[PDB]
Design a protein around this ligand. Structure first.
Ligand code: AMP
Ligand code: CL
Length: 188
């Protein structure tokens, strides 16, 4: 029944405050790169996007659930704007990089990585930069977005007052997308 795109992540609850901040941030970035498009759903990756044989989807999800069930929830901060590209530099992303909480994300990834290895899937980047992507475009737009634009985006973020949105975000769940299927699991 096919091989399915499979990706593990921490869902980020995009509250109105957050989406309203993006209503300021994104047009600002679009003055440099108009073709940026807002993300539809917001996540912090714990795995690469891999491909997994259909009959292993449910077993994979169960393996993840068992490990995540024991993993304690934690707080993180994601308020540092950073530009990412995919590996081929055919997509560029504006993200909010995690600072405080990064070590807890590393611990999460260590558990996810074990599952990846159990299913012969690629483990996460060895130099991970955990982040919430806010917008993306085709191509390599680093030259337009880094420097002045990034500085201005950071200034907007630095000026934003609700700590719960970016400064003290509580992880609640992990999710695995496989194809068009989404499997949620609570952290402890
Ligand atoms: N050090 C890194 N850690 C995590 N993702 C990264 C890193 N460098 C670049 N990225 C890329 O960031 C892109 C967007 O990330 P995501 O929003 O998690 O899908 C992915 O295509 C990753 O390859
Ligand atoms: Cl453009």
């Amino acid at each position: 029944m096919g091989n399915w795109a499979t990706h593990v992540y921490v869902p980020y609850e995009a509250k109105e405050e957050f989406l309203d901040l993006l209503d300021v941030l994104l047009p600002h970035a679009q003055t440099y790169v108009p073709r940026l498009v807002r993300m539809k759903v917001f996540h912090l990756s714990l795995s690469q996007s891999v491909v997994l044989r259909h009959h292993w989807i449910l077993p994979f999800v169960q393996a993840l659930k068992a490990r995540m069930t024991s993993f304690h929830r934690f707080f993180f901060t994601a308020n540092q704007v950073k530009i990412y590209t995919n590996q081929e530099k055919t997509r560029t992303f504006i993200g909010l990089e995690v600072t405080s909480g990064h070590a807890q994300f590393l611990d999460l990834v260590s558990e996810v990585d074990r599952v990846m290895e159990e299913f012969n899937l690629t483990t996460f980047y060895q130099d991970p930069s955990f982040h919430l992507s806010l917008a993306w475009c085709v191509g390599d737009a680093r030259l337009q977005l880094e420097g002045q634009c990034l500085q201005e985006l950071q200034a907007i973020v630095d000026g934003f007052e609700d700590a719960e949105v970016l400064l003290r975000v509580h992880t609640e769940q992990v999710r695995c997308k496989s194809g068009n299927k989404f499997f949620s699991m609570p952290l402890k």
